[PDB]
Design a binder for this molecule. Structure first.
Ligand code: NA
Length: 129
């Protein structure tokens, strides 16, 4: 599924990301825009053989099992395929575990490089929430 900006803002708010670990909703919408262009089916194969999955491009080295990332972890206790659903539950619940570890939203390269230190609330402005 390819979300609209305000559509994803509403869904992420309903799924409890607004101010999760102190990160305003605009941070999460900005991260999804630059990680996946709001496409839940986005995948990216990394140099190290791990893969990034879904609207927040969550990586198989740590967070999910894809059966092809040897010696990796599955800290979200999910198949990586769960991160590609039109239903953002698995992506949101896994993102909540990720952002609760030491480095917060710095875990997302696109957030660090394209959202952090910017007017992120612009991403939810005009939206009915
Ligand atoms: Na894994």
């Amino acid at each position: 599924k390819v979300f609209g900006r305000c559509e994803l803002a509403a869904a992420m708010k309903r799924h409890g990301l607004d101010n999760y670990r102190g990160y305003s909703l605009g941070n999460w919408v900005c991260a999804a825009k630059f990680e996946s262009n709001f496409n839940t089916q986005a995948t990216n194969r990394n140099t190290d053989g791990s893969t990034d999955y879904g609207i927040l491009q969550i990586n198989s080295r740590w967070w999910c099992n894809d059966g092809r990332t040897p010696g990796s972890r599955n800290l979200c206790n999910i198949p990586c395929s769960a991160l590609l659903s039109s239903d953002i539950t698995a992506s949101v619940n896994c993102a909540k575990k990720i952002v609760s570890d030491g480095n917060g939203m710095n875990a997302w390269v696109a957030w660090r490089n394209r959202c952090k230190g910017t007017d992120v609330q612009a991403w939810i402005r005009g939206c009915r929430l």
